[PDB]
C-alpha cells in the first residue's frame, strides 16, 4: 500500500505538474520566436528602403 501511494504521487506530479509545465513553456517559446522573426523581417524591409 505504501509503494502504491508513492508510485501514485510520482504519477500525479508528472500528470498535473511536470508535463503541463513543459507543454506551456514549449507553447510560449514557440510563439515568442515566431513574433520576433516577423518583427525582424519587418525592420529589414525598412532598412532595405533606407
Amino acid at each position: 500500500a505504501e509503494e502504491i501511494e508513492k508510485t501514485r504521487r510520482r504519477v500525479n506530479a508528472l500528470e498535473y505538474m511536470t508535463i503541463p509545465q513543459l507543454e506551456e513553456t514549449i507553447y510560449y517559446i514557440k510563439m515568442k520566436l515566431e513574433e520576433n522573426e516577423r518583427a525582424e523581417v519587418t525592420r529589414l524591409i525598412k532598412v532595405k528602403n533606407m
Binding site: E34, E35, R38, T42, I45
Partner: protein
C-alpha cells in the same frame, strides 16, 4: 476617363494626371482587350492615385489600358425583392433570376448608430435549440457568435438556426440574411440545397462567397450582407437575423490583403487593426429607439488549433455579447449540437426571458440546471481521478443528472425544433431527478407550481 496608368507593381497600380479623386473611391479599368476590371483607391496624392484591382493585374498592358473613376465607394443596390434571392460577394445575382431593380444604392460601410439613438437589445428570438433558448438566450439586436473548430458540425447548426429561428406573436416580419465567406463549392452547395429543400429560401437573402473568389470580395461579403440587413430591418421594419460563416476565412483574407499592401503585421500576423475591423461588422447589430425592426448577428468561426486565445476568437469575444462553444468531447459523444454550456454565455439573455417573453419559470430553472450540471460533471470527473467509491450517493445522483442533461436536453438533433415551452418543460423533468431540498436556486412558489 484617363489613359495615364504610370505604374503597376503586383496587385497595385498608380494612376497619374487625375483630378478630383477621393480616398476609397471605386474605379473601373478598361484593359487593352476590352476586359473590365474594378478596383478601389487606396491612397490619393496631388495628381496620383494608388489603386488596387479586385481581380489582380495579370495580363494588363499599361499604355493601352484606361481608368474611369466612378465617384462613389462600394455600393449595394437594395430592394425588398432581395428576399428569396442569391447573390455573390459583390451583390451580383448568382441564381440567374430576373432583373433586380434597386430602390436606392447604399455605401456598404453603413453609418454609425448614434449611441443616444441606440436601443438596448430586447425581446426573445426562438432558435428552437434548447441549449441556446434556455441557457444562452438569443435576444433581438444581440451579437451572439458560435465558436467551433474544423471538423465540428457548425455548418449543420448554422443551417438549422437559419430555418428554425422565429419571433413569437408577430407574423410575417422576420427574415434571415446568410453570408457565406470563403467557403468551398461543395459547402456552398450544402447551404443552397438545404435552404431550397426546407423552404428557408423564401424568407432569406443569401450572399455566397467562395474560397477561390478574390480576397477583396471575400472581405466585402459581410458588408454587403449587413447593408442589406439594415435596409430590411430599419427601412422595412423587419427583424433580421444575420448569420455569417466562416469568420476565420474572413480574417485570413484580411491578412492576405493586408500583407499585399505590405502593412506591418500585428499579433500572430493579423493586421494591427483586426479588432477595429471586426468591430465595424459586429457593431452593426442592435436596435434603434423609435424604429420597429432589428439586426441580430450570429458570426460563426472556427478556432485555429481550438485555441480560444487566437486573435480571431479572442478579439471576437471582446466584441460580441457572449459566445456559443462547440466541443470535441461532446461531438465525439454524438451530442447534436455539441454545445458546451459551461464555457458558453449570452450576456443579454435577461432582456428576452421571463413572463410574457418566454415563461415565468425561465430564469430560475436556467440557474438551477446550469448549477446542477456543473456539479454533475464535477462528480463525473471525481469518479475518473479517485474511483466510483470516492462519491457520496448524491454525488452519484448529480453524475447521473449530467448524463441525461447531455443526452436528452443538449442533444436534440439538427433537424429538431423545440418550442420554448418544450424546452422549459423538459428542464423540469431533469430537475425532478434531484431532491427538492437540493433545488436551492429556485423559490418555493415556482417549485410548487411547476415541478412534476
Amino acid at each position: 476617363e484617363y489613359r495615364t496608368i504610370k505604374e503597376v507593381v503586383g496587385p497595385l497600380m498608380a494612376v497619374e494626371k487625375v483630378s478630383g479623386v477621393k480616398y476609397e473611391e471605386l474605379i473601373e479599368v478598361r484593359m487593352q482587350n476590352g476586359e473590365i476590371r474594378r478596383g478601389q483607391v487606396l491612397e490619393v496624392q496631388e495628381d496620383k492615385a494608388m489603386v488596387q484591382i479586385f481581380e489582380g493585374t495579370s495580363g494588363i498592358n499599361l499604355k493601352n489600358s484606361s481608368v474611369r473613376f466612378l465617384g462613389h465607394p462600394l455600393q449595394l443596390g437594395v430592394s425588398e425583392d432581395m428576399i428569396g434571392r442569391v447573390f455573390d460577394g459583390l451583390g451580383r445575382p448568382k441564381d440567374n433570376g430576373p432583373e433586380i431593380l434597386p430602390e436606392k444604392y447604399l455605401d456598404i460601410n453603413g453609418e454609425v448608430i448614434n449611441p443616444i439613438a441606440r436601443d438596448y437589445p430586447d425581446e426573445f428570438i426562438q432558435t428552437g435549440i434548447s441549449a441556446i433558448d434556455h441557457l444562452n438566450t438569443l435576444v433581438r439586436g444581440q451579437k451572439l457568435p458560435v465558436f467551433s473548430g474544423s471538423g465540428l458540425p457548425h455548418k449543420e447548426l448554422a443551417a438549422q438556426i437559419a430555418r428554425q429561428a422565429t419571433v413569437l406573436d408577430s407574423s410575417d416580419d422576420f427574415a434571415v440574411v446568410f453570408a457565406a465567406i470563403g467557403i468551398t463549392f461543395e459547402e456552398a452547395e450544402f447551404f443552397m440545397e438545404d435552404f431550397r429543400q426546407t423552404g428557408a429560401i423564401d424568407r432569406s437573402v443569401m450572399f455566397m462567397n467562395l474560397a477561390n473568389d478574390p480576397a477583396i470580395e471575400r472581405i466585402a461579403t459581410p458588408r454587403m450582407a449587413l447593408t442589406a440587413a439594415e435596409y430590411l430591418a430599419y427601412e422595412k421594419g423587419m427583424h433580421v437575423l444575420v448569420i455569417m460563416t466562416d469568420m476565420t476565412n474572413y480574417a485570413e483574407a484580411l491578412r492576405e490583403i493586408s500583407a499585399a499592401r505590405r502593412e506591418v503585421p500585428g499579433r500572430r500576423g493579423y493586421p494591427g487593426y483586426l479588432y477595429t475591423n471586426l468591430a465595424t461588422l459586429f457593431e452593426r447589430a442592435g436596435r434603434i429607439r423609435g424604429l420597429k425592426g432589428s439586426v441580430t448577428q450570429i458570426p460563426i468561426l472556427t478556432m485555429p488549433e481550438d485555441d480560444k486565445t487566437h486573435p480571431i476568437p479572442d478579439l471576437t469575444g471582446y466584441i460580441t455579447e457572449g459566445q456559443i462553444i462547440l466541443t470535441r468531447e461532446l461531438y465525439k459523444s454524438g451530442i447534436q449540437p455539441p454545445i458546451d454550456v459551461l464555457p458558453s454565455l449570452s450576456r443579454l439573455k435577461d432582456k428576452g426571458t421571463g413572463a410574457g417573453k418566454t415563461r415565468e419559470d425561465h430564469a430560475a430553472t436556467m440557474n438551477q440546471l446550469f448549477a446542477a450540471y456543473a456539479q454533475g460533471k464535477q462528480a463525473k470527473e471525481l469518479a475518473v481521478v479517485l474511483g466510483e467509491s470516492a462519491l457520496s450517493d448524491i454525488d452519484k445522483i448529480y453524475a447521473k443528472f449530467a448524463e441525461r442533461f447531455e443526452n436528452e436536453y443538449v442533444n436534440q438533433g439538427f433537424y429538431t425544433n423545440r418550442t420554448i415551452t418544450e424546452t422549459l418543460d423538459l428542464g423540469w423533468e431533469l430537475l425532478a431527478m434531484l431532491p427538492r431540498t437540493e433545488l436551492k436556486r429556485i423559490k418555493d412558489d415556482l417549485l410548487d407550481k411547476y415541478l412534476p
